[PDB]
């Protein structure tokens, strides 16, 4: 039961021990490329929690995402329109950096499927997240009852369709009951059903 201790050590991040490890790790991740393959999960305990198993066809890729708010892509800093829509630099991104990271490593590797992402490091301009990607066509993954669900074609590009945990957090599905009543099948699908005019044959 070693992992109970490593979860406790990762609860104490500000500790001098882990601050040193976190500084060396970050100085190194800075010297590498944005999307890098990591041979092993740099966090074996967190990977295991999100479904990583050290079998062939399970891969870990670290993706570096830039830290800060969104700036709208309007030329010359001008968004012509009603005054409410005139604002370009104070906007906050709609999806978290954890979700942006998954979407970026999904485009880089369209053949693989994305399980989940964990935070590895952060700095004043960049946050690093590590993603677990599964090869749907590997024999070990196909012939495994536990992970053969990813091999199904509906799970193709899950991070493009907001079905990963980070994407589902952005859609508000991490919440149920009051407040989540108008965002269940989807925010758009609730709007369509609520605003549908049902002209029954006997009306």
């Amino acid at each position: 039961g070693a992992y109970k201790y490593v979860q406790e050590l990762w609860r104490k991040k500000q500790s001098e021990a882990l601050h040193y490890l976190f500084r060396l790790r970050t100085w190194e991740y800075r010297q590498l490329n944005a999307i890098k393959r990591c041979s092993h999960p740099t966090r074996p305990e967190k990977a295991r929690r999100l479904g990583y198993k050290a079998k062939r066809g399970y891969v870990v890729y670290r993706v570096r995402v830039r830290r800060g708010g969104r700036k709208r892509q309007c030329v010359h800093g001008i968004s012509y329109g009603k005054p409410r829509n005139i604002g370009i630099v104070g906007l906050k991104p709609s999806r978290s950096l954890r979700a942006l990271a998954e979407q970026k490593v999904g485009r880089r590797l369209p053949s693989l499927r994305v399980l989940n992402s964990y935070w590895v490091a952060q700095d004043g301009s960049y946050k690093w997240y590590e993603v677990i990607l599964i090869d749907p066509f590997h024999p070990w993954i196909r012939n495994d009852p536990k992970i053969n669900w990813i091999c199904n074609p509906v799970m193709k590009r899950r991070e493009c369709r907001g079905l990963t945990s980070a994407g589902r957090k952005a859609r508000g599905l991490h919440n149920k009951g009051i407040g989540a009543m108008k965002l269940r099948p989807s925010k758009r699908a609730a709007w369509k059903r609520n605003h549908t005019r049902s002209l029954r044959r006997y009306r």
Partner: protein, 53 residues
């Protein structure tokens, strides 16, 4: 029906009428025009079934 054409009015000052016209000046998008939409097009949302107790 009648609205797949691209027609915009030529306008006042060409000695024509003010209705929407296509590229050659052919009248379009109007009940009076040949190939124009109906003024009030039939709809499938009419109540067809009446209710009896």
């Amino acid at each position: 029906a009648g609205v797949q054409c691209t027609a915009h009015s030529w306008g006042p000052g060409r000695a024509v009428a003010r209705l929407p016209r296509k590229h050659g000046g052919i009248g379009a998008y109007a009940n009076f025009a040949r190939g124009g939409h109906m003024a009030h097009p039939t709809t499938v949302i009419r109540r067809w079934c009446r209710k009896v107790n």
